[PDB]
Every structure is written in C-alpha cells, then in structure tokens.
Coordinates of all heavy atoms in Angstrom, one line a residue:
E10 N 10.8 -2.1 20.7 CA 11.6 -1.6 21.8 C 13.0 -1.3 21.5 O 13.7 -2.0 20.9 CB 11.5 -2.7 22.9 CG 11.8 -4.2 22.6 CD 13.3 -4.5 22.7 OE1 14.0 -3.7 23.5 OE2 13.8 -5.5 22.1
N11 N 13.4 -0.1 21.7 CA 14.7 0.6 21.4 C 15.1 0.5 20.0 O 16.2 0.7 19.7 CB 15.7 0.0 22.4 CG 15.5 0.2 23.7 OD1 15.1 1.3 24.2 ND2 15.7 -0.8 24.5
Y12 N 14.2 0.1 19.0 CA 14.5 0.2 17.6 C 13.4 0.6 16.7 O 12.2 0.5 17.0 CB 15.1 -1.2 17.1 CG 16.4 -1.5 17.8 CD1 16.5 -2.4 18.8 CD2 17.6 -1.1 17.0 CE1 17.8 -2.7 19.3 CE2 18.8 -1.5 17.5 CZ 18.9 -2.2 18.7 OH 20.2 -2.6 19.2
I13 N 13.8 1.1 15.5 CA 12.9 1.4 14.4 C 13.6 0.7 13.2 O 14.8 0.8 13.0 CB 12.5 2.8 14.2 CG1 11.5 3.0 13.0 CG2 13.7 3.7 14.1 CD1 10.2 2.4 13.3
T14 N 12.8 -0.1 12.4 CA 13.3 -0.8 11.4 C 12.6 -0.8 10.1 O 11.4 -1.1 10.1 CB 13.4 -2.4 11.9 OG1 14.1 -2.4 13.1 CG2 14.1 -3.1 10.8
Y15 N 13.2 -0.4 9.0 CA 12.7 -0.5 7.7 C 13.1 -1.8 7.1 O 14.3 -2.1 7.1 CB 13.1 0.7 6.8 CG 12.4 0.6 5.5 CD1 11.1 1.2 5.5 CD2 12.9 0.2 4.4 CE1 10.3 1.2 4.3 CE2 12.1 0.3 3.2 CZ 10.9 0.8 3.2 OH 10.2 0.8 2.0
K16 N 12.1 -2.6 6.7 CA 12.4 -4.0 6.3 C 12.3 -4.3 4.8 O 13.2 -5.1 4.4 CB 11.4 -4.9 7.0 CG 11.7 -6.4 6.7 CD 11.0 -7.4 7.7 CE 11.8 -7.3 9.0 NZ 13.2 -8.0 8.7
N17 N 11.6 -3.6 4.0 CA 10.9 -3.9 2.8 C 11.5 -5.1 2.0 O 12.7 -5.1 1.7 CB 10.8 -2.7 1.8 CG 9.9 -3.0 0.7 OD1 9.2 -4.0 0.6 ND2 10.0 -2.0 -0.3
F18 N 10.6 -6.1 1.7 CA 11.0 -7.3 1.1 C 11.7 -7.2 -0.3 O 11.7 -6.1 -0.9 CB 9.8 -8.2 0.8 CG 8.7 -7.5 0.0 CD1 8.6 -7.8 -1.4 CD2 7.7 -6.8 0.5 CE1 7.7 -7.2 -2.2 CE2 6.8 -6.1 -0.2 CZ 6.7 -6.4 -1.6
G19 N 12.2 -8.3 -0.8 CA 12.8 -8.4 -2.1 C 14.3 -8.0 -2.1 O 15.1 -8.9 -2.2
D20 N 14.5 -6.7 -1.9 CA 16.0 -6.4 -2.1 C 16.5 -5.4 -1.0 O 17.7 -5.3 -0.9 CB 16.2 -5.7 -3.5 CG 17.5 -5.9 -4.0 OD1 18.4 -6.6 -3.3 OD2 17.8 -5.3 -5.1
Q21 N 15.6 -4.7 -0.2 CA 16.1 -3.8 0.7 C 16.8 -4.5 1.9 O 16.2 -5.4 2.6 CB 15.0 -2.9 1.3 CG 14.5 -1.8 0.4 CD 13.6 -2.2 -0.6 OE1 13.0 -3.3 -0.5 NE2 13.4 -1.4 -1.7
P22 N 18.1 -4.2 2.3 CA 18.7 -4.7 3.5 C 18.0 -4.0 4.7 O 17.4 -2.8 4.6 CB 20.1 -4.3 3.5 CG 20.1 -3.0 2.4 CD 19.0 -3.3 1.5
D23 N 17.9 -4.8 5.7 CA 17.0 -4.4 6.9 C 17.8 -3.2 7.6 O 18.8 -3.4 8.1 CB 16.9 -5.5 7.9 CG 16.0 -6.6 7.2 OD1 15.2 -6.3 6.3 OD2 16.2 -7.8 7.5
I24 N 17.1 -2.0 7.6 CA 17.7 -0.9 8.2 C 17.3 -0.7 9.6 O 16.1 -0.5 9.9 CB 17.3 0.4 7.4 CG1 17.6 0.1 5.9 CG2 18.0 1.6 7.8 CD1 19.2 -0.1 5.7
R25 N 18.3 -0.7 10.5 CA 18.0 -0.6 12.0 C 18.4 0.8 12.4 O 19.5 1.3 12.1 CB 18.9 -1.6 12.7 CG 18.5 -3.0 12.4 CD 17.3 -3.5 12.9 NE 17.2 -3.5 14.4 CZ 17.7 -4.4 15.2 NH1 18.3 -5.5 14.6 NH2 17.6 -4.3 16.4
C26 N 17.7 1.5 13.3 CA 18.0 2.7 13.9 C 17.6 2.6 15.4 O 16.4 2.5 15.7 CB 17.3 3.9 13.2 SG 17.8 5.6 13.9
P27 N 18.6 2.7 16.2 CA 18.3 2.6 17.7 C 17.6 3.9 18.1 O 18.0 5.0 17.8 CB 19.7 2.4 18.4 CG 20.5 1.8 17.3 CD 20.0 2.5 16.0
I28 N 16.6 3.7 19.0 CA 15.8 4.9 19.4 C 16.5 5.7 20.3 O 17.1 5.2 21.3 CB 14.4 4.3 20.1 CG1 13.7 3.5 19.0 CG2 13.6 5.5 20.5 CD1 13.4 4.2 17.7
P29 N 16.6 7.0 20.1 CA 17.2 8.0 21.0 C 16.6 8.0 22.4 O 15.4 8.5 22.5 CB 17.2 9.3 20.3 CG 16.9 9.0 19.0 CD 16.1 7.7 18.9
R30 N 17.2 7.6 23.4 CA 17.0 7.8 24.8 C 17.3 9.3 25.1 O 18.1 9.9 24.3 CB 17.5 6.9 25.8 CG 17.1 5.4 25.5 CD 15.7 5.3 26.1 NE 15.8 5.3 27.5 CZ 14.8 5.8 28.3 NH1 13.6 6.1 27.7 NH2 14.9 5.9 29.6
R31 N 16.8 9.8 26.2 CA 17.3 11.1 26.7 C 18.7 11.1 27.2 O 19.3 10.0 27.2 CB 16.2 11.7 27.6 CG 15.0 12.2 26.9 CD 13.9 12.9 27.7 NE 13.1 12.1 28.6 CZ 12.0 12.6 29.3 NH1 11.7 13.9 29.1 NH2 11.3 11.9 30.0
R32 N 19.1 12.3 27.6 CA 20.6 12.4 28.0 C 21.0 11.6 29.2 O 21.8 10.6 29.0 CB 20.9 13.8 28.3 CG 20.8 14.8 27.2 CD 21.8 14.5 26.1 NE 23.2 14.7 26.6 CZ 24.3 14.1 26.1 NH1 24.2 13.5 25.0 NH2 25.5 14.3 26.7
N33 N 20.5 11.9 30.3 CA 20.6 11.1 31.5 C 19.3 11.1 32.3 O 19.3 11.5 33.5 CB 21.8 11.6 32.3 CG 21.7 13.2 32.5 OD1 20.8 13.8 32.1 ND2 22.7 13.7 33.2
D34 N 18.2 10.8 31.6 CA 16.9 10.8 32.4 C 16.8 9.6 33.3 O 17.2 8.5 32.9 CB 15.8 10.8 31.3 CG 14.4 11.1 32.0 OD1 14.1 12.2 32.4 OD2 13.7 10.1 32.2
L35 N 16.3 10.0 34.5 CA 16.3 9.0 35.5 C 15.1 8.1 35.7 O 14.3 8.2 36.6 CB 16.7 9.8 36.8 CG 16.0 11.2 36.8 CD1 14.7 11.3 37.6 CD2 17.0 12.2 37.4
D36 N 14.9 7.3 34.7 CA 13.8 6.4 34.7 C 14.3 5.0 34.3 O 13.4 4.0 34.3 CB 12.7 6.8 33.8 CG 13.1 6.9 32.4 OD1 14.3 7.0 32.1 OD2 12.2 7.1 31.5
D37 N 15.6 4.7 34.1 CA 16.0 3.4 33.6 C 16.9 2.8 34.5 O 18.1 3.0 34.6 CB 16.7 3.6 32.2 CG 17.2 2.3 31.8 OD1 16.4 1.4 31.3 OD2 18.5 2.0 31.8
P38 N 16.4 1.8 35.3 CA 17.3 0.7 35.7 C 17.6 -0.2 34.5 O 18.7 -0.2 34.1 CB 16.4 0.0 36.7 CG 15.5 1.0 37.2 CD 15.1 1.8 36.0
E39 N 16.5 -0.8 33.9 CA 16.7 -1.7 32.9 C 15.7 -1.6 31.7 O 15.5 -2.6 30.9 CB 16.6 -3.2 33.4 CG 17.8 -3.6 34.4 CD 19.2 -3.6 33.6 OE1 19.1 -4.0 32.4 OE2 20.1 -3.4 34.2
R40 N 14.9 -0.5 31.7 CA 13.7 -0.5 30.8 C 13.9 0.0 29.4 O 14.6 0.9 29.2 CB 12.6 0.4 31.6 CG 12.2 -0.1 32.9 CD 11.2 0.8 33.6 NE 9.9 0.8 32.9 CZ 9.4 1.7 32.1 NH1 10.0 2.8 31.9 NH2 8.2 1.5 31.5
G41 N 13.2 -0.8 28.5 CA 13.3 -0.4 27.0 C 12.5 0.9 26.8 O 12.1 1.7 27.6
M42 N 12.2 1.0 25.5 CA 11.5 2.3 25.0 C 10.8 2.0 23.6 O 11.5 1.5 22.7 CB 12.5 3.4 24.8 CG 12.0 4.7 24.8 SD 11.4 5.1 26.4 CE 10.4 6.5 26.1
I43 N 9.5 2.1 23.7 CA 8.7 1.8 22.4 C 8.1 3.1 21.9 O 8.2 4.1 22.5 CB 7.7 0.7 22.8 CG1 6.8 1.2 24.0 CG2 8.3 -0.5 23.1 CD1 5.7 0.3 24.2
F44 N 7.5 2.9 20.7 CA 6.6 4.0 20.2 C 5.2 3.7 20.5 O 4.8 2.6 20.9 CB 6.8 4.2 18.7 CG 8.1 4.8 18.3 CD1 9.0 4.1 17.5 CD2 8.3 6.1 18.6 CE1 10.1 4.7 17.0 CE2 9.5 6.7 18.2 CZ 10.4 6.0 17.4
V45 N 4.3 4.7 20.5 CA 2.9 4.6 20.7 C 2.1 5.2 19.7 O 0.8 5.0 19.6 CB 2.6 5.2 22.1 CG1 3.3 4.6 23.3 CG2 3.0 6.6 22.1
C46 N 2.6 6.0 18.8 CA 1.9 6.7 17.7 C 2.7 6.7 16.5 O 4.0 6.6 16.6 CB 1.5 8.1 18.2 SG 0.2 8.2 19.4
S47 N 2.1 6.9 15.3 CA 2.7 7.0 14.0 C 2.7 8.3 13.4 O 3.7 8.8 13.1 CB 2.1 5.8 13.1 OG 0.8 6.1 12.9
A48 N 1.5 8.7 13.0 CA 1.2 10.1 12.4 C 1.9 10.3 11.2 O 2.9 11.2 11.2 CB 1.5 11.2 13.5
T49 N 1.7 9.6 10.2 CA 2.4 9.9 8.9 C 1.9 11.2 8.2 O 0.8 11.7 8.5 CB 2.2 8.7 7.9 OG1 2.8 8.9 6.7 CG2 0.6 8.5 7.6
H50 N 2.8 11.7 7.4 CA 2.4 13.0 6.7 C 3.0 13.0 5.3 O 4.3 12.7 5.3 CB 2.8 14.2 7.5 CG 2.2 15.5 7.0 ND1 2.9 16.2 6.0 CD2 1.2 16.2 7.3 CE1 2.2 17.3 5.8 NE2 1.1 17.3 6.6
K51 N 2.3 13.6 4.4 CA 2.6 13.5 3.0 C 2.5 15.0 2.5 O 1.4 15.4 2.1 CB 1.7 12.6 2.2 CG 2.0 12.4 0.8 CD 1.2 11.3 0.1 CE -0.3 11.6 0.2 NZ -0.7 12.7 -0.9
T52 N 3.6 15.8 2.6 CA 3.6 17.2 2.3 C 3.7 17.6 0.9 O 4.1 18.7 0.6 CB 4.6 17.9 3.3 OG1 4.5 19.3 3.1 CG2 6.0 17.3 2.9

C-alpha cells in the first residue's frame, strides 16, 4: 500500500519508492493504493 520496495538480502539497502497517485483524482478521503498485477518482461 502506497509503496514498492526492493529488499534483497545480504547487502542491498532497502529501496523504497512511494507509489504515484494521480494529480487530484477524487477518490481519496483516506484510502491507500496497492498493486494487483506484476507482468515481468525480459527484452
């Protein structure tokens, strides 16, 4: 909810990126924002 985080063990410091909400979209009193799909790609 509202974040994406790369964690990898051992030596990587935990990288946080807050999820971009829209500009002024009118759906948030107090509501978070999650992902629902991943869809990796290896080009």
Side-chain angles (χ1 to χ4, degrees):
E10 50 90 18
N11 298 318
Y12 286 97
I13 181 68
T14 304
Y15 189 77
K16 180 165 282 293
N17 188 12
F18 60 92
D20 207 2
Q21 283 83 16
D23 296 332
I24 307 300
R25 303 286 298 278
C26 182
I28 299 307
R30 296 284 293 154
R31 287 188 281 185
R32 294 293 301 162
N33 49 0
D34 190 75
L35 34 95
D36 57 349
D37 176 72
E39 294 294 328
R40 297 182 69 251
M42 200 70 194
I43 52 173
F44 288 119
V45 297
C46 289
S47 63
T49 182
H50 190 274
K51 182 172 70 69
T52 182

